[PDB]
């Protein structure tokens with residue numbers, strides 16, 4: 001439904 | 013040599029923020045601690061040689077499969093360094109062992125984690141060995157039908173295994189027993205699959221029955237377990253062994 005915390009941390 | 017990089021990128025210690033002294037409050041506190049630790053695990057993996065170059069999808073898959081092995085392994089290291097493995101050093105403000113557990117299942121999970129820590133005392137595990145073994149645990153479980161960049165993963169895994177073997181076998185501290193030691197470290201990594209299987213089964217239960225049991229999970233774990241649980245349940249999880 002939205003970007004995961006795991007994905008956001010890996011791509012920030 | 014990734015060993016030099018590994019010492020540099022090592023996460024710092026996080027506090028639990030402990031207190032009512034009940035099972036549901038202990039479990040909720042531990043789960044919230046796991047969420048803080050997970051932030052430092054992801055930042056550690058982000059700047060990890062080899063892993064940093066896999067597709068985003070593969071990086072997510074690997075972290076979701078191995079988050080438990082990473083946290084229980086780091087817990088065993090802290091327990092060893094700070095208490096000589098007498099207690100489980102969850103955080104500086106949350107230190108205990110099996111003797112504080114009254115429920116049979118909770119005692120056994122606590123004991124299983126303590127037994128890994130005691131194996132660090134028996135081996136006199138060094139920081140160098142620990143950091144490579146920690147990387148090998150991130151690369152210990154893959155999807156049944158493999159990853160997107162399966163070959164690149166296999167290359168990086170074989171390289172980390174070789175870095176462990178060369179480091180152990182070439183050290184003068186292990187003369188006369190270096191191969192025996194290497195095989196003890198690889199057996200300890202295989203035995204991590206057995207412990208983690210049990211910690212995950214209790215975790216999946218407390219997650220499914222979270223509301224009924226009053227066991228709280230942070231957002232990081234809610235999202236991770238939500239993706240991991242259907243993969244594990246469907247048999248889409250291939251643990252990689254050294255001696256099995």
Ligand SMILES: C[C@]12C=CC(=O)C=C1CC[C@@H]1[C@@H]2[C@@H](O)C[C@@]2(C)[C@H]1C[C@H]1O[C@@H](C3CCCCC3)O[C@]12C(=O)CO
Pocket residue numbers: 039040042043045046049080083084087102103113117118119121122211212214215216218219227
């Ligand atoms: C990841 C975890 C957190 C911080 C840490 O430093 C190390 C770990 C590894 C073990 C991780 C831990 C926490 O989430 C709590 C977990 C997930 C646990 C495994 C499960 O088992 C029980 C244990 C906790 C110790 C005493 C016996 C019961 O708690 C867990 C659970 O299911 C609660 O819902």
